[PDB]
Structure 1
Amino acid sequence: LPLDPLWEFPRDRLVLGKPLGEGAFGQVVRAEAFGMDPARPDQASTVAVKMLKDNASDKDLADLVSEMEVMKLIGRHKNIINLLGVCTQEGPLYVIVECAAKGNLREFLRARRPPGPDLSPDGPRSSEGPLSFPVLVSCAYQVARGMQYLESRKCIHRDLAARNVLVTEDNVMKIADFGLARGVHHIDYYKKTSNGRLPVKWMAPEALFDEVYTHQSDVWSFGILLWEIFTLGGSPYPGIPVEELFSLLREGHRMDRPPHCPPELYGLMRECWHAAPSQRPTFKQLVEALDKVLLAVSE
């Protein structure tokens, strides 16, 4: 690999720490960076490091190198996992990105579901869950903002889900893994992830049936993400096996309106799930529509 002085960071200024998980595109590892700001050489900062496994092919290297160059080109936005630096010299390939200490949005929501009535009343709010409606709207808005930026940078996140949206310490939404070479030509539509996810339930019809991805494919996926948000991490198409998902999509079946969800947002969901991709809202339109809702419920 060639030296890029613009993004190059001394590997000795990185202290790797407890792994965050591993997948087809390598492993993600939490780490501390010293002097990520060149103005303050000794200041510590908390980052995340993308790397390869011990069992990696030269294809896996090319894939990670690919993701590196993608992040170099897309630039900074508050609502995406930004590239901070890289380590390409005299050691293993480290791609240093931002950290999101609160984990992915799905787990974030599932951990903060309101207490069931089986718990005894203790305190003036003992029935008041961590998550309120305006905050849930804000999460949706932040994801839409970032996706609109990614679209303007001509980037198609072909898997957009609550699982791939990370939450910072300050409860800021950040889109992750938007530059992966996801290998769309060989998707096992039936295989379930180790945590039980069936990624096919986020795929737009033209992507699932015709292998076609556009920015409107992500708008569809964003519509599913909206469903995830207002079910507080619920699994889409509940109880429906992949085989039944196939025929239901061909009939044009859509998810019902989830409980405790206003018609304004289920409306946006159904707009994102329109058959013709040209009749789904753009990400710019989603931002504006979600903004009006957010402004309405905030005094």
Structure 2
Amino acid sequence: YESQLQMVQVTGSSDNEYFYVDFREYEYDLKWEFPRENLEFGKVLGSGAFGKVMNATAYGISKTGVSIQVAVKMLKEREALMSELKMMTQLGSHENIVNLLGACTLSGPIYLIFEYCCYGDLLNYLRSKREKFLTFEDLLCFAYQVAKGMEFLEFKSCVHRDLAARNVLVTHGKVVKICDFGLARDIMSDSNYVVRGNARLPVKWMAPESLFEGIYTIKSDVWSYGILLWEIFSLGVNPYPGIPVDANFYKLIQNGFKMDQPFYATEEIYIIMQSCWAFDSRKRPSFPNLTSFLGCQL
């Protein structure tokens, strides 16, 4: 298990000159410690091979002496989860990120407590609304919000190695938040991940430099973001629909193959998508760039 949301530290001007920040040697700030008895567990939000994410009510975790809904990450009946915890305590909060609220790490199994998103992952949300088109303005708003969340991550020197609609969650006012919900799903039962030794790769969302060099930068995320845009404006269709993942898929990407304009996208949005898929990472737009284009389109 490992969160795909990771902090990195750039070492050179070249894309591959950076390393991942590992919080294993850092210390956990106990001000985040929450009483596990103040958690009232509800339904399972999703489960997988390593553990699961549970819904629950938390007594007094919020600034007020009120009880609220939260999402609790946990492992199958550890250091990796502690590192994710430490990492999220250092990130700071943002409206378009699923924020950490607390943790239980001392008198029992490790629990990471996050903000709860009542309407599940954005992919299922979109698919559940194919027969009820939610408006185009909402679509543009989801897009703008994800760009803003990614802009925050870029600012905090982080990258998401699995950016996709399945890792974006929806809450009350049509607000979406980026996270890593990998713990809440069985990667083995998800065909969007291709098995390769010890890796489970979301090939159809990967930038060429990630596919062919194992490189992951904020620019690679701009590419994945373009795929996520296609997911939004097609209402949740699998990317490169009908095309299998095999040696020919890799060759297609290498040759510059790009998806067609999805039905709900306008030509301006599609032009943005296409630029996100520039083979050369330098040619792709930046997130602050994308946030403006979209803010404007809005």
Instruction: Return the TM-score normalized by structure 2.
Output: 0.83
- How far has the Cα of 1:193 moved from its partner? 4.7
Q: Which residue of 2 aligns with 1:138?
A: 141
Give the superposition deviation at 1:168. Answer: 0.6
Judging by fraction of residues, say which structure has more strand.
2
* Aligned equivalents of 2:214, 2:144: Cα separation in 1: 28
Question: CA–CA distance in 2 between the matches of 1:147 and 1:38?
Answer: 26
Structure 2 unaligned segments of length 5 or more: list them.
1-23, 194-201
Q: 1:197 is matched with which residue?
A: 192
1:24, 1:277 → 2: CA distance?
A: 34
Determine the structure 1 residue equivalent to 2:56.
31
For 1:254, the equivalent position in structure 2 comes to 258
- The answer to whether the Cα contact below 8 Å between 1:67 and 1:179 also exists between their aligned partners in 2 is no
Report the counterpart of residue 219 of structure 1 in structure 2: 222
What is residue 63 of structure 1 aligned with on the other side? 80
The count of aligned residue pairs is 262
Partner residue in 2 for 1:79: 96
Quote the offset at 1:197 in angstroms.
Answer: 2.5
Matches within 5 A, 1:113-152: 113-114=130-131, 129-152=132-155
Mapped pair 1:17 → 2:42 = yes
Deviation at 1:179, TM superposition (A): 10
* 1:264 is aligned to 2:264: no
Given residue 280 of structure 1, which amino acid in structure 2 is its aligned partner? Answer: R
Residue deviations 1:238-262, cap 9 Å, x none? Answer: 1111112111112211111122321
1:272–1:25: structure 2 CA closer, same or farther, 3 Å change rule?
farther
The 2-side partners of 1:206 and 1:3 are apart by 34
SS in 2 for 1:197: coil
Structure 1 CA distance for aligned equivalents of residues 31 and 213 of structure 2: 40
> Under a length normalisation based on structure 1, what TM-score does the superposition of the two structures give?
0.83
Which residue number in structure 1 is paired with residue 4 of structure 2?
none
Q: Cα deviation per residue 1:161-218 (whole Å; 9 max; x = unaligned)?
A: 00000001222110011899xxxxxxxxxx9752442421000000010111110000
Identity fraction in percent: 51
Whole-Å separation in 2 of the counterparts to 1:86 and 1:78: 20
Q: 1:248 to 1:51 in 2, by over 3 A?
A: same
1:44 aligns with 2:61: no
Name which one, 1 or 2, has greater alpha-carbon Rg.
1
Q: Which of the numbers 110, 113, 133 marks the counterpart of 1:93?
A: 110
In the alignment, is the contact (CA less than 8 A) between 1:107 and 1:233 conserved in 2?
yes
Paired with 1:9 and 1:291, the residues of 2 have a C-alpha distance of 38
| AA of the residue aligned to 1:94 | Y
